[PDB]
Structure formats: structure tokens, C-alpha cells
């Protein structure tokens, strides 16, 4: 409910030339966020396989594969490839965010 | 005075005057002669063309063309060099004369020859390509710029002609757009424009409409996407007539499934299913003996490897230019490491390592899927920005890495 | 027209004759000529083609 | 600012044409096609056009006429009439 | 006329000649309907107005 | 127990709102400039 | 209404020629209506509203 009030405030303040940009920008951001989510799962999946090798419970596996990375953020030879893939994923996410930031500028006439 | 009704003209013995005017760069007189006189096709002969190419061809232009071949060899440039060498030592004499005029940068004469040419738009695109590749060569800025300007002028002339023709007729214009080469350059108008990077020609409503129609195939255009997807998921339903068609049930279904749009959608869905199966196998696998789903995953990976090999064969060394193709190939080879490690029943350390290889490869497959999603969503005006921005980011990342090492070095010493 | 075997292909005359042929096509008229290959009738035949 | 419109259309062309050039068989069975091609790659290895060209030439003549008359119609002064007067 | 070099001149001249031929000959503009139809067919606005 | 999924969903929603507000504040003047 | 009808027809694409001509005509009619309405608004206030 507080977020809904925040949204009405934001719309009220920006009811002018900026408004269209805002709304357009808004949708772009959400997509990136969704994208981010669909990455975490995969990472979590991998993380699960790395850490909890032995697990034979549907619900426990479901919970650990879904919301382990979120908790982690809230809180031998693997290192080199791990950092490489971290850099690759960060590249993708950062370019997505930056594209979302300038998305409206190119389309503006 | 000289050209008048009273002074009857045989128009058969004027060849010498035409040759003299042609060599001396007299375009208006050439046009006047062509208005009422000989036939350019009949007049042209092997001996005359050889003399034109040998005696009167400037050595500076020949050196420039040799430099172009040595440095910027192209599919059309090698052919034109072979033609020049042959004549210096389906005949299409008009094309040879047009090329001869273009190389020496005779704008008006080239225009007249193009007007007299049987095939114009293809010739114009080829002239644009040749002039641009010559302009890439830089021995003197004057000619390098004049050739580029002439290429741009010819490109815009071809654009105007093709848009007017497209306005005139639809099906005939589309048919001509893909006309096979008549030995002019070994390629059609479309590929020739692609090689020369004619933004104006490609950035045309007619070409875009034709490309969209091809990208839909025989399935009806503007039939709306949600209907297509619903029919794809429910295969029998498209037989009910939900999806129209451009112009027999077996033919209908074959056309529907052969449309590259439906093919891409099916490929994406199959990739998602493969990723889900990979995730299931990752947490459920017996070290001693793999089960059937693992073998199915192996078969799908083999199919993906075959597709990657096909992409290599089709594209070449330029395939590895993009970093994401390199990443996909590296991940596909990386999966083979885990496959090999799984081959050992003993050495539990090796088994765990192979399991970790599979585990890590899953993430890069997910990143590849993310990339296809990102490209699909941003296939519009933003696309170029995206790709450009992307490369920039990576450089900075690389830069960051080469800093960490140094810091780490220092940290170690501390 | 063009009784002499030599005919001048001036832009004005070519445009005028093209307009005449277009007018005839619009009304589906009949064009009467001599039929000789050489001369102005050659232009008429080419425009008809 | 002038060339933004054409550049992205060019990029869209390149991506779409590149994908279309590839085979359009459903992915799970795509392998089969390749196998078939392999046979063709090994077993085998081991008037109307004039009409279209004439039509294109007709359109070229129309375009030439149009561009020629454009220059004549560009002038808003009839100096020929003044000279005749 | 030599001076006239604009587009759509042959049709105008032919229509004017046909109208002149029909004017004096035949009914001699006895019925306005026929002349109006003939002029409308070739789209000669100025003569129709005048 | 079950709180985690809705909690992360609302976290994403709030982050979306705050991020779009910041980004709008960053480019606010550009559109109005003549 | 003409602008609306022409725009919705232009949305349909069987041949680009008519699809573009209809859109251009719709834009022309829309701007003509804009000019007429702004002139009328300048003329009178309450009657225009
Ligand atoms: C399948 C389930 C488990 C995921 C549901 C979560 C949703 C938040 C995801 C699923 C599909 C996603 C959408 C796929 C397509 C689009 C449209 C896209 O914008 C456009 O393509 C143009 C729309 C316009 O401008 O009008 C922005 C993201 C959105 C809503 C994506 C963002 C997030 C969505 C809705
Ligand atoms: C059964 C599994 C479901 C997940 C399938 C069955 C029907 C499918 C839907 C049928 C139609 C559409 C609309 C479709 O939107 C488009 O056609 C794309 C529009 C555009 O991008 O321009 C997106 C997927 C969706 C919800 C499909 C997604 C997946 C659904 C829900
Ligand atoms: C849980 C699963 C079954 C949900 C997915 C249902 C599918 C119908 C989704 C998955 C991927 C989606 C596709 C991703 C890419 C494209 C192409 C896209 O068009 C383009 O290719 C580029 C132009 C553009 O749309 O922006 C339109 C939507 C489509 C088919 C998306 C719409 C629906 C797809 C096939
Ligand atoms: C020597 C080894 C240990 C380092 C390998 C890691 C690579 C990721 C580094 C090495 C060289 C770097 C490249 C040097 C030159 C370029 C081209 C540069 O873009 C351009 O200069 C223009 C290219 C274009 O736009 O077409 C962007 C970064 C890149 C790939 C740099 C980014 C990262 C690279 C490939």
C-alpha cells in the first residue's frame, strides 16, 4: 500500500514533459530486474550443486535452489573460471541496465 | 547545322567519330550521336575495347587498382582485376565499357553508359562497391574522395530508381530484387549492396517489407503473434483456420512449420526445455552409472555441437570475431571436459570435479539464453547502441582485471 | 510524319509522342501509320512495345 | 542525427538475413537435414528474364524523364517567353 | 506552339482541335449536353468555364 | 517459512520504484532544455 | 473520422503503396481539421467549446 502511495506521488510530481520518459523508462527497468531474477536461479542452481551435493527432498531442494542466493546477498582450480563467468554475467547485467537508462533517448524525435 | 534532316545520315560509318569523342571525354557529343545513329552494342568490338584498356589507360589508376587488390581484395575486385588483365593483354561489352569509364572517373560518360546499359540497378550497385573499395585505397586524397563521392551519387541514383520501380509494381519488383547474376559480378543486387554497405538502399520501405515477408515465409503476414503462438502450441488447431495464409493440409502444416519465425520460437522453447532438463539432471545423477536422461542430455549437446560446427563452416574466421560466439564455443568444449571426467567410475575426486564442470557450464548456457533474450527484445533503433555499448563495457572490465593483479601483487608483498 | 528515313530523336518530340501514345491507350484508340521499320514509325513501334 | 534511421535498419537487415540464410528446420530434427546434406556433400561430389529486364528499362526511362523534367520545372521564371517578347 | 513545353500538352491540343471541329459542324452547338459531354471527356476545365 | 518469495518480490518492486525515481532525477533537465 | 478510418486502413498492409497513401491522406485531413478548429477557437470561445 505504501508503494502504491509512492507511485501516485511520483506520477503527480512528473505530470509534464518528462512523464512519457518516466513511464517508458519504468517498463525498461522492470525487464532488466526480471532478467536479473532469471539469472539468480541459475547461479543458485549451480551454487546448490557445488555445496549441497546430497539432497533428496523436493521442498528442501526447491527452497534451497530458489532463495539461497537472495539470503547470501542479504547476509582448487574453480577460482579462475568462476571469476571469468562473474565478469561475463556482470557485463550482461550492466549493459542491460545502461540500455534501460538511455532507452527513451534514441527514440525521441 | 551538321545534324539535320536534309543531310541524310547513313549512321554506319560514324564509328571513328564516336571513338574519337569517347576517348577525348566528350559526353555531350556521345549522347548526341546516340540520339540518332549507330548501335553501341554493334560498334563495340574486342580489338577496340582492348585498345581502350591498354593504350589509353592511365598508369596511376592501374597502380591504385593493384594496391587495392594487394590490400583490400574482394570478391568483385578480384573479378574486375581479372577482367582488366584479360583485356589489357554473354560477353557483356557494355559492362566492361562502364567499368572502364568508372575507373578513370568519367562521371558524365559513366552516366550515359549506365543509361544505355541493359541492367542498371545491379550495375549501379556494383559501381558503388568498386568505387568505395577504390576510395578505401589512399595514395592521393583527391581521387580517393572523388571516387567516394561518385559512389554515393550512383548509390542514391540506384535507390531512387528502385523505389520508383517498387512503387510501380510489387511482385515484379521483388522478383527483380533477387535476380541471379548474369556474370556481371557473380552476385545479385541484394548481396552486392550488402558488401558495399549501402545504408540508403537497405534502409528502404520496399526492401524491409520484402525482408519481413521472407522472415514470415508462406505464413500470412500481419496475422498477429498470439494467434501464431497458440497455433504452435496446439498443432492441430492451425488446421481449423485460426491463422490465415498468404496464398492441402500437409502443405499448410509444412509451410507453417517451415516459417523461420515459428522455427525460432520452437528453437527457443526447446532450448528452455533443455535447460530445465539440465537443471533436473544436475541435482539428480548417479556417479556410478548415468541414467537415460543423462544420455538424452548428451544427445542434445551433440546436436548443439553439430549446429555450432555448421555455423563455423558457414561463417568462417569472422565467426570468432564476436565475443559471444567465442563464449558459446568455449562453453561447448568445456562441457566435454565434464563428459570426460564422468567417464571414470573410480577416482571420486575426478567424479566430483566433472560434476562441478557440468554445474559451472549450466550457468554459461543460462547466460547464452539471456543474451538471446536481450537481442530479441532490443531488435530496433536501440540495437546498434546496445552492441556498441556492450563492447565498451567489456574493455573496462578487462581494464579492471589488469588492475586487480597489480593490487594483488602489491598486497602479496605487503 | 517522318517521311524521310532519317528522324531526329529530340527529347521534346519523344515526350510528345509518348504522351500521345498514353492518351491513345487511355481511350483505347486506333493508331494508323505506314508500318515502315525505318523512321518515326520505328519510334511508334518501340513505344507501343 | 541525420543517419540514425538508416543505420538501425541496416543492422536489422544484417541480423534477419543472416538468420534466414540458416536452415529453418525444427531444432530437434535439424540434425537429420545435415545428415541428408552430408550425402549430397559426399555422394554427389564424389525470355521471362528478358521481359523483366525490358520492364526495368522502361522504369529507368520513366525515371530519367522525371529527373530531366524536374530541373526544367524547378525554375519559376519563364525567360524563354521574355526573350520571345 | 513551340513555346509550350510543359507536361500534358498533347491531350489539351487534341481536345481543343476536337472541340473546334465539333463547334461549327453538325448541330452547331444546338444542344449544350453534347458539347458539355465532349468537353468533360477530355477534362478541359478552362474551355468549359469560358 | 513462506515469507521469502513475497518478500523478494516486494523488494524488487520497491527497488524498481526507487531506481526509476533516481534515473528520472538524473535526466530531469535534459528534456526541458531548449 | 476520415483520419481514423484512413489510419486503421493503413494499419492493414497488403500493398505498401495504398497503405502509405491512406496514411498521408489521413495526416493531411488531420492537420486540416486542426487548422479549422484552431481558427474557430480563435473566433469564439464558448461556442467553440
Ligand atoms: C513465466 C513466469 C514464471 C514469469 C512471470 C514474471 C513476469 C514479470 C515476466 C514474464 C514475462 C516477462 C515480460 C515479457 C515481455 C515484456 C514486454 C517488454 O516491453 C515490450 O516488449 C514492449 C511493450 C510496450 O512498450 O508496449 C517489457 C518486459 C515484459 C513485460 C517482460 C517483463 C517481465 C515479464 C512479464
Ligand atoms: C501451456 C503452457 C503455457 C505457458 C503457454 C500456453 C499458451 C501460451 C501463450 C499464448 C499466447 C501468448 C502471447 C504472446 O505474445 C506475443 O505474441 C508476442 C507479442 C510481441 O512481442 O510483439 C506471449 C506468450 C503467450 C502468453 C503464450 C506464452 C505461454 C503460454 C501461456
Ligand atoms: C514457460 C514457457 C513455455 C513460456 C514461453 C512461451 C513462448 C511462446 C515464449 C518463449 C520465448 C518467446 C519469444 C522470444 C522471441 C520472440 C521473437 C519476437 O519477434 C522477434 O523475433 C524480434 C522482433 C520483436 O518482437 O521485438 C516476438 C516474440 C517471440 C516469439 C517471443 C514470444 C513467445 C516466446 C516464444
Ligand atoms: C593477453 C591475454 C592474457 C588477455 C586476453 C583477455 C582479452 C579479453 C583482452 C586482451 C586484449 C583485449 C582487447 C584489445 C582490443 C580491443 C578492441 C576494442 O574495441 C576497438 O578498439 C574497436 C573494435 C570495433 O569497434 O570494431 C575493445 C576491447 C578489445 C577487444 C580489448 C578487450 C579485451 C581483450 C580482448
Amino acid at each position: 500500500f505504501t508503494l502504491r502511495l509512492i507511485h501516485i506521488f511520483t506520477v503527480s510530481r512528473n505530470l509534464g514533459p518528462k512523464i512519457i520518459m518516466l513511464q517508458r523508462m519504468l517498463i525498461d527497468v522492470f525487464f532488466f530486474l526480471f532478467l536479473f531474477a532469471v539469472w539468480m536461479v541459475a547461479f543458485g542452481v549451480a551454487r546448490q550443486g557445488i555445496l549441497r551435493q546430497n539432497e533428496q527432498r523436493w521442498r528442501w531442494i526447491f527452497r534451497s535452489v530458489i532463495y539461497e542466493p537472495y539470503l547470501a546477498m542479504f547476509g582448487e582450480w574453480i577460482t579462475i573460471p568462476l571469476v571469468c563467468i562473474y565478469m561475463l554475467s556482470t557485463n550482461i547485467l550492466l549493459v542491460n541496465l545502461l540500455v534501460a537508462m538511455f532507452g527513451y533517448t534514441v527514440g525521441i524525435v | 547545322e551538321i545534324f539535320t534532316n536534309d543531310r541524310r545520315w547513313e549512321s554506319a560509318d560514324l564509328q571513328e567519330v564516336m571513338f574519337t569523342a569517347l576517348i577525348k571525354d566528350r559526353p555531350k557529343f556521345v549522347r548526341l550521336f546516340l540520339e540518332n545513329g549507330l548501335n553501341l552494342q554493334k560498334f563495340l568490338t574486342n580489338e577496340v575495347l582492348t585498345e581502350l584498356f591498354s593504350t589509353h589507360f592511365s598508369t596511376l589508376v592501374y597502380r591504385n587498382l593493384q594496391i587495392a587488390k594487394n590490400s583490400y581484395n574482394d570478391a568483385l575486385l578480384t573479378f574486375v582485376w581479372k577482367l582488366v588483365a584479360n583485356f589489357r593483354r554473354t560477353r557483356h561489352p557494355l559492362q566492361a565499357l562502364f567499368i572502364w569509364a568508372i575507373l578513370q572517373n568519367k562521371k558524365e560518360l559513366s552516366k550515359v553508359i549506365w543509361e544505355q546499359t541493359k541492367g542498371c540497378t545491379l550495375a549501379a550497385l556494383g559501381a558503388s562497391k568498386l568505387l568505395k573499395t577504390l576510395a578505401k585505397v589512399k595514395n592521393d586524397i583527391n581521387a580517393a574522395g572523388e571516387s567516394e563521392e561518385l559512389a554515393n551519387e550512383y548509390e542514391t541514383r540506384a535507390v531512387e530508381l528502385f523505389t520508383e520501380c517498387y512503387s510501380n509494381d510489387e511482385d515484379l519488383a521483388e522478383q527483380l530484387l533477387v535476380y541471379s547474376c548474369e556474370a556481371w559480378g557473380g552476385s545479385n543486387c541484394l548481396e552486392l549492396a550488402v558488401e558495399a554497405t549501402d545504408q540508403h538502399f537497405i534502409a528502404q520501405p520496399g526492401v524491409q517489407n520484402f525482408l519481413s515477408k521472407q522472415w514470415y515465409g508462406e505464413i500470412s503476414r500481419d496475422t498477429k503473434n498470439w494467434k501464431i503462438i497458440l497455433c504452435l502450441f496446439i498443432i492441430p488447431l492451425v488446421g481449423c483456420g485460426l491463422v490465415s495464409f498468404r496464398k492441402k493440409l500437409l502443405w499448410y502444416y509444412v509451410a507453417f512449420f517451415t516459417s523461420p519465425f515459428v522455427v525460432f520460437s520452437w528453437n527457443v522453447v526447446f532450448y528452455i526445455a533443455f535447460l530445465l532438463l539440465f537443471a533436473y539432471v544436475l541435482l539428480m545423477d548417479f556417479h556410478s552409472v548415468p541414467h537415460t536422461p543423462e544420455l538424452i542430455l548428451y544427445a542434445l549437446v551433440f546436436v548443439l555441437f553439430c549446429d555450432e560446427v555448421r555455423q563455423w563452416y558457414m561463417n568462417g574466421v569472422n565467426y570468432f570475431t564476436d565475443l559471444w560466439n567465442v563464449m558459446d564455443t568455449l562453453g561447448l568444449f568445456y562441457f566435454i571436459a565434464g563428459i570426460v571426467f564422468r567417464l571414470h567410475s573410480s577416482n571420486k575426486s575426478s567424479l566430483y570435479s566433472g560434476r562441478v564442470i557440468f554445474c559451472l557450464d549450466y550457468i554459461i548456457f543460462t547466460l547464452r539464453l539471456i543474451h538471446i533474450f536481450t537481442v530479441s527484445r532490443n531488435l530496433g533503433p536501440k540495437i546498434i547502441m546496445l552492441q556498441r555499448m556492450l563492447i565498451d563495457v567489456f574493455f573496462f572490465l578487462f581494464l579492471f582485471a589488469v588492475w586487480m593483479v597489480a593490487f594483488g601483487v602489491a598486497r602479496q608483498g605487503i | 510524319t517522318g517521311g524521310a528515313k532519317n528522324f531526329a530523336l529530340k527529347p521534346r518530340m519523344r515526350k510528345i509522342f509518348s504522351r500521345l501514345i498514353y492518351i491513345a491507350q487511355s481511350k483505347g484508340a486506333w493508331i494508323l501509320t505506314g508500318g515502315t521499320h525505318y523512321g518515326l514509325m520505328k519510334y511508334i513501334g518501340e513505344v507501343v512495345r | 542525427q541525420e543517419n540514425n534511421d538508416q543505420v538501425w535498419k541496416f543492422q536489422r537487415y544484417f541480423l534477419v538475413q543472416e538468420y534466414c540464410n540458416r536452415l529453418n528446420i525444427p531444432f530437434p530434427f535439424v540434425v537429420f537435414a545435415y545428415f541428408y546434406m552430408v550425402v549430397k556433400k559426399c555422394f554427389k561430389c564424389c525470355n521471362e528474364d528478358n521481359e523483366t529486364l525490358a520492364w526495368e528499362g522502361v522504369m529507368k526511362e520513366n525515371y530519367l524523364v522525371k529527373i530531366n523534367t524536374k530541373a526544367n520545372d524547378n525554375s519559376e521564371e519563364m525567360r524563354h517567353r521574355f526573350r520571345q517578347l | 506552339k513551340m513555346e509550350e513545353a510543359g507536361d500534358e500538352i498533347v491531350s489539351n491540343a487534341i481536345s481543343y482541335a476536337l472541340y473546334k471541329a465539333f463547334s461549327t459542324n453538325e448541330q452547331d452547338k444546338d444542344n449544350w449536353n453534347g458539347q458539355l459531354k465532349l468537353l468533360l471527356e477530355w477534362n478541359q476545365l478552362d474551355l468549359a468555364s469560358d
Side-chain angles (χ1 to χ4, degrees), chain A residues 1-52 54 56 58-62 64-75 77-107, chain B residues 2-4 9 11-12 14-41 43-46 48-73 75-89 91-94 96-226 228-247 249-258 260-285 290-322 324-326 328-344 346-347 349-414, chain C residues 2-4 8-9 11-13 15-24 26-37 39-41 43-45 47-48, chain D residues 4-17 19-20 23 25-34 36-38 42 45-46 50-69 71 78-79 82, chain E residues 1-2 5-6 9-17 19-23 34-49:
Chain A
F1 273 135
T2 315
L3 276 312
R4 183 264 200 68
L5 170 55
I6 289 286
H7 187 300
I8 75 161
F9 274 129
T10 291
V11 155
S12 88
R13 174 184 154 65
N14 308 130
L15 182 58
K18 314 158 194 172
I19 187 69
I20 69 198
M21 161 195 88
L22 160 57
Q23 49 178 232
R24 204 81 51 201
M25 151 170 313
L26 188 145
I27 175 53
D28 293 329
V29 167
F30 216 116
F31 172 72
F32 153 75
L33 202 45
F34 154 62
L35 215 49
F36 168 96
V38 63
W39 186 88
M40 279 339 295
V41 171
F43 162 69
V45 152
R47 161 258 164 84
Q48 178 67 1
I50 288 304
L51 257 297
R52 192 54 279 205
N54 304 323
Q56 195 63 18
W58 295 83
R59 173 167 46 266
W60 286 339
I61 282 299
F62 154 98
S64 171
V65 86
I66 278 174
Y67 58 76
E68 274 291 352
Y70 292 127
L71 288 192
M73 176 177 293
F74 168 99
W77 155 271
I78 86 177
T79 310
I80 314 92
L82 190 48
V83 62
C84 156
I85 288 144
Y86 259 109
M87 304 228 285
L88 216 63
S89 36
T90 40
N91 176 24
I92 285 289
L93 281 307
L94 196 32
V95 56
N96 276 113
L97 195 165
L98 295 180
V99 158
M101 154 174 327
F102 301 69
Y104 59 94
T105 47
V106 60
Chain B
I2 176 53
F3 275 113
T4 201
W9 267 112
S11 304
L14 191 173
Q15 159 269 6
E16 178 58 20
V17 185
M18 171 75 58
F19 182 24
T20 297
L22 184 64
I23 188 65
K24 290 192 181 302
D25 176 15
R26 297 298 208 280
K28 276 160 281 187
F29 267 77
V30 153
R31 186 188 301 274
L32 178 53
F33 304 160
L34 290 176
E35 226 53 28
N36 52 260
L38 82 184
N39 289 337
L40 183 43
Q41 159 54 14
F43 148 66
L44 288 179
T45 58
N46 190 309
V48 172
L49 194 59
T50 292
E51 192 277 344
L52 276 162
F53 267 102
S54 181
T55 66
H56 309 294
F57 197 73
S58 60
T59 189
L60 161 44
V61 175
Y62 176 77
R63 158 54 57 102
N64 193 341
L65 190 63
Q66 189 159 349
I67 295 299
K69 164 171 193 330
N70 277 18
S71 296
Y72 308 150
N73 180 16
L76 178 59
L77 197 138
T78 181
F79 162 81
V80 83
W81 203 101
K82 288 201 302 181
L83 187 279
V84 163
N86 171 31
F87 275 138
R88 207 100 184 278
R89 176 263 303 173
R91 205 192 315 277
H92 294 277
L94 269 163
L97 175 54
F98 187 55
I99 289 167
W100 174 94
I102 276 164
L103 290 173
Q104 297 186 319
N105 307 19
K106 301 188 182 304
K107 315 201 211 202
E108 282 66 354
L109 196 66
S110 69
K111 204 71 65 177
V112 172
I113 297 299
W114 170 86
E115 287 183 358
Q116 295 295 341
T117 302
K118 193 70 170 296
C120 48
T121 182
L122 170 56
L125 269 298
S128 174
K129 175 85 189 309
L130 181 53
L131 284 174
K132 262 170 179 174
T133 182
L134 275 182
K136 285 175 177 173
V137 180
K138 78 204 85 173
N139 200 17
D140 64 76
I141 190 68
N142 309 319
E146 149 170 24
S147 298
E148 196 279 340
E149 211 176 80
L150 181 60
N152 177 26
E153 141 181 340
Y154 259 96
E155 166 212 82
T156 185
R157 164 171 319 281
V159 168
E160 298 186 350
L161 207 180
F162 188 89
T163 185
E164 185 286 335
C165 192
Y166 203 86
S167 177
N168 170 252
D169 194 319
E170 210 40 61
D171 194 328
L172 279 170
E174 283 177 10
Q175 200 287 336
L176 161 60
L177 177 59
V178 77
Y179 186 53
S180 182
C181 53
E182 199 177 357
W184 190 108
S187 56
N188 60 18
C189 171
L190 202 61
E191 312 149 311
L192 190 51
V194 166
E195 296 294 346
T197 63
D198 306 81
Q199 298 179 356
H200 286 295
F201 189 94
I202 278 165
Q204 188 187 158
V207 178
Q208 290 292 351
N209 181 92
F210 163 74
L211 256 189
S212 286
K213 179 152 53 175
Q214 186 213 80
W215 157 258
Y216 275 88
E218 307 181 5
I219 196 175
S220 153
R221 207 194 168 198
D222 71 47
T223 201
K224 297 297 230 199
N225 298 354
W226 75 265
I228 298 181
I229 273 57
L230 188 43
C231 271
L232 160 51
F233 264 135
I234 316 173
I235 318 184
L237 155 81
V238 86
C240 299
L242 196 178
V243 181
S244 61
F245 283 86
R246 208 172 67 185
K247 206 169 200 163
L249 189 144
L250 164 141
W251 182 89
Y252 267 139
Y253 283 3
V254 165
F256 177 87
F257 275 104
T258 311
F261 180 92
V262 174
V263 173
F264 178 78
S265 301
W266 184 286
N267 296 10
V268 164
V269 171
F270 154 81
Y271 192 94
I272 284 172
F274 163 83
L275 268 186
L276 271 193
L277 186 66
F278 205 141
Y280 164 85
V281 167
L282 221 33
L283 321 185
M284 270 67 87
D285 70 79
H291 297 65
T292 45
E294 212 160 338
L295 307 180
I296 303 301
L297 219 75
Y298 290 13
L300 270 68
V301 160
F302 165 83
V303 167
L304 266 58
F305 183 50
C306 294
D307 178 17
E308 200 71 349
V309 153
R310 205 282 305 274
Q311 292 300 138
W312 299 344
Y313 186 98
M314 181 89 56
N315 184 321
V317 179
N318 188 21
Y319 181 79
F320 290 67
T321 307
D322 163 78
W324 294 112
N325 302 10
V326 154
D328 188 5
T329 295
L330 273 163
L332 216 52
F333 284 170
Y334 193 93
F335 187 86
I336 289 317
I339 289 283
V340 168
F341 270 96
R342 275 297 315 265
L343 202 68
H344 289 46
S346 61
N347 192 329
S349 181
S350 68
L351 192 289
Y352 177 78
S353 74
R355 194 193 175 290
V356 170
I357 316 322
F358 277 29
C359 179
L360 256 297
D361 191 303
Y362 178 92
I363 279 173
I364 57 174
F365 273 135
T366 315
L367 276 312
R368 183 264 200 68
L369 170 55
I370 289 286
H371 187 300
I372 75 161
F373 274 129
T374 291
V375 155
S376 88
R377 174 184 154 65
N378 308 130
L379 182 58
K382 314 158 194 172
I383 187 69
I384 69 198
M385 161 195 88
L386 160 57
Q387 49 178 232
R388 204 81 51 201
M389 151 170 312
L390 188 145
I391 175 53
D392 293 329
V393 167
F394 216 116
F395 172 72
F396 153 75
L397 202 45
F398 154 62
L399 215 49
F400 168 96
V402 63
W403 186 88
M404 279 339 295
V405 171
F407 162 69
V409 152
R411 161 258 164 84
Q412 178 67 1
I414 288 304
Chain C
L9 176 41
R12 161 180 272 274
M13 291 325 268
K15 195 202 200 143
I16 284 164
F17 272 94
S18 151
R19 183 66 64 186
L20 162 61
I21 298 299
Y22 168 77
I23 295 157
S26 304
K27 320 302 182 180
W30 285 3
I31 300 176
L32 308 178
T33 53
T36 65
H37 214 320
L40 179 278
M41 317 197 160
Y43 182 84
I44 294 300
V47 173
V48 165
Chain D
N4 321 85
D5 173 16
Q6 55 180 334
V7 168
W8 78 265
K9 276 170 176 173
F10 188 107
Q11 221 68 9
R12 186 206 138 181
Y13 173 110
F14 188 63
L15 301 188
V16 169
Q17 173 51 221
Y19 194 110
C20 286
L23 267 172
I25 322 305
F27 212 114
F29 318 82
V30 153
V31 60
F32 285 10
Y34 296 152
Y36 177 76
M37 311 335 297
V38 165
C42 298
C45 183
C46 182
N50 301 27
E51 179 271 354
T52 59
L53 295 176
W55 164 68
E56 162 76 359
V58 168
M59 314 312 313
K60 178 172 73 172
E61 200 73 1
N62 298 17
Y63 163 79
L64 290 175
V65 167
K66 187 159 299 179
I67 181 51
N68 294 22
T69 166
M78 62 315 308
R79 273 288 177 280
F82 156 84
Chain E
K1 262 200 38 172
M2 271 65 88
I9 293 291
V10 184
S11 185
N12 176 22
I14 288 200
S15 162
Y16 199 126
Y19 168 96
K20 275 212 318 194
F22 188 87
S23 65
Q35 190 151 222
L36 176 55
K37 278 285 293 190
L38 162 57
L39 205 51
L40 167 57
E41 176 57 23
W42 291 89
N43 187 92
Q44 186 72 356
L45 169 59
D46 84 82
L47 252 52
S49 167

